[PDB]
Amino acid sequence: GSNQNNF
Numbered sequence: 001g002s003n004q005n006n007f
């Protein structure tokens, strides 16, 4: 799957 981190 794809991943996104919004710090």
Ligand SMILES: [Zn+2]
Binding pocket: 001, 002, 003
């Ligand atoms: Zn993946």
